[PDB]
Design a binder for these strands. Structure first.
Ligand SMILES: [Ca+2]
Ligand SMILES: [Ca+2]
Length: 220
DNA sequence: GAATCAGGTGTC
């Protein structure tokens, strides 16, 4: 309903939101949603279909590699910027979920906007839904992991699976709980088998060795 | 759905 005020001044406004910033595995997902024919139900009082039939949508992704090289915050806007880019209508303005985000289109940030703007409310759905059906095929591809349930998140299951099964190249290797399970041994193997770029290989080395450092200081 | 447990990272 706040979405309506912005449309009056800027005309074509979009909604951005992301999913999967707290995961241990997978990319981060973003979604950009221009929308006209209004939908009751999104931030009001089976709309997946209505949103698809009745809106403009761009989706962006950042590979887990990219979360590890760039970091979880930058990888996010990287996807978000790819969403606007993948969106078919150029908006004059954007309402982003969160705070402290500057995107390639002039915009404003809304705290709990995924819960007060319809355009963001839309993309936030789009985002999860895609991510979810993505984690699904990850589950099929990596049968050992219940990706289809925990969504790559840091649940008790997912951890046990990592511990019992080993880390994957689709794990965010710079993520504390994954990191703490990491041996350069594996890194090397991942590298040698061509399952990680040299860039990532280095980064993670530098990171492990830095993890030891703060423990070393902290032990003194 | 609202609470309440759990687990992630980022900027100021
Ligand atoms: Ca939220
Ligand atoms: Ca979201």
């Amino acid at each position: 309903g706040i979405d309506e005020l912005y449309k009056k001044e800027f005309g074509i406004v979009a909604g951005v939101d992301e999913a999967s910033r707290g995961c241990l595995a997978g990319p981060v997902v973003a979604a950009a949603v221009v929308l006209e024919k209004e939908i009751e139900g999104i931030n009001d009082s089976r709309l997946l279909d209505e949103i698809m039939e009745k809106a403009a949508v761009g989706i962006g992704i950042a590979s887990p590699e990219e979360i590890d090289l760039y970091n979880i915050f930058n990888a996010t806007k990287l996807a978000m910027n790819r969403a606007l880019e993948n969106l078919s209508v150029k908006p004059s303005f954007v309402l982003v979920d969160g705070k402290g985000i500057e995107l390639s289109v002039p915009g404003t940030c809304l705290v709990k906007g995924d819960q007060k703007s319809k355009l963001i409310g839309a993309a936030s759905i789009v985002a999860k839904v895609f991510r979810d059906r993505l984690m699904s095929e990850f589950h099929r591809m990596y049968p050992q992991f219940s990706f289809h349930k925990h969504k790559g998140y840091a649940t008790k299951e997912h951890l046990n699976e990592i511990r019992k099964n080993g880390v994957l190249p689709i794990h965010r290797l710079s993520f504390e709980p994954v990191l703490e399970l990491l041996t350069d041994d594996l890194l090397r193997e991942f590298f040698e088998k061509g399952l990680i770029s040299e860039n990532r290989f280095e980064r993670i080395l530098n990171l492990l060795g830095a993890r030891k450092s703060v423990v070393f200081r902290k032990e003194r």
